[PDB]
Design a protein around this ligand. Structure first.
Ligand SMILES: [Ca+2]
Ligand SMILES: [Ca+2]
Ligand SMILES: [Ca+2]
Ligand SMILES: [Ca+2]
Ligand SMILES: [Zn+2]
Length: 316
């Protein structure tokens, strides 16, 4: 909508107060004109027809519980935008400042969130398995990273390329959580998962096996469920990325950690320069090795650490 850029205030899903960039034209809309060609948040009104209505508010105050998921979707979209721009010199998901659109209140008790090819979509959860999914910065950045992957490598969402596509989203979702620096960790979705249970999440990158995911290639899932295990076999790549960043000894193989910024550089370069729609795990290892070589040199610690991390998870 055409109008002036304004600044509203509200609470997110977890009760935290924050400012949001809004647009004024009769009503105050969730439209942030300060990043690229806009970040726009919509109300799906418990339906599944998308995108719904651009979020409109009478007073620019967003403190109702109904407001909370939209406050977070909008705000964490802005944080993810800032991460890609400031850290990777990437302007929005297509690299050309595409408008970022998100809808909240999708369906009723919907325990999930996703990128549908064109926009972000967040359920409210059923209050038992999930609370509103946009309250998790790693969930928001995970799903927006799918948009990034769709415009770059284009990793097909099945089998190995699919598990890579998933891991890439867990990795950058986690790096975005660290960038924002509020209780960061190497698990996925903990802020919105199971309000009655402390310390759990959907997935762990540091210990995929915690939730039954493989942490080594010899344990890969080779069946047909979950598009050939895209959320299952990502554990193998997640563990390798965790090792590259943090270091550790995993099945007897020692890895020297090089830290989060370098992990982010190597994997962003792999994603955008080397990976293709059909890349398998072994091809990911070669892309990550070639990325690390471009960035730090072939004799570097960074290159040696990438080789060790993939060795540790059984990927040759
Ligand atoms: Ca209001
Ligand atoms: Ca966290
Ligand atoms: Ca997390
Ligand atoms: Ca929990
Ligand atoms: Zn995903």
């Amino acid at each position: 909508i055409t109008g002036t850029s304004t600044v509203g205030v509200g609470r997110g899903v977890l009760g935290d107060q924050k400012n949001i960039n809004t647009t004024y034209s009769t009503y105050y809309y969730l439209q942030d004109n300060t990043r690229g060609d806009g970040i726009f948040t919509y109300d799906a009104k418990y339906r599944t027809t998308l995108p719904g209505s651009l979020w409109a508010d009478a007073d620019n105050q967003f403190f109702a519980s109904y407001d909370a998921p939209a406050v977070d979707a909008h705000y964490y979209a802005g944080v993810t935008y800032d991460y890609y721009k400031n850290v990777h010199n990437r302007l929005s998901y297509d690299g050309n400042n595409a408008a970022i659109r998100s809808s909240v209140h999708y369906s009723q008790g919907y325990n999930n969130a996703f990128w549908n090819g064109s926009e972000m979509v967040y359920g409210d959860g059923d209050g038992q398995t999930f609370i509103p999914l946009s309250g998790g910065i790693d969930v928001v950045a995970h799903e927006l990273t799918h948009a990034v992957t769709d415009y770059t490598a284009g990793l097909i969402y099945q089998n190995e390329s699919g598990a890579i596509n998933e891991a890439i989203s867990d990795i950058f979702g986690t790096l975005v959580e660290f960038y924002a620096n509020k209780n960061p960790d190497w698990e996925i979705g903990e802020d919105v998962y199971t309000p009655g249970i402390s310390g759990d999440s959907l997935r762990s990158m540091s210990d995929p096996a915690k939730y039954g995911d493989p942490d080594h290639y010899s344990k890969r899932y080779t069946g047909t469920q979950d598009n050939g295990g895209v959320h299952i076999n990502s554990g193998i790549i997640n563990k390798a990325a965790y090792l590259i960043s943090q270091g550790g000894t995993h099945y007897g193989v020692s890895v020297v950690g090089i830290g989060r910024d370098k992990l982010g550089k190597i994997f962003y370069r792999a994603l955008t320069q080397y990976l293709t729609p059909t890349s398998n795990f072994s091809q990911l290892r070669a892309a990550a090795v070639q990325s690390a070589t471009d960035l730090y040199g072939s004799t570097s610690q960074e290159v040696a650490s990438v080789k060790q991390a993939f060795d540790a998870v059984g990927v040759k």
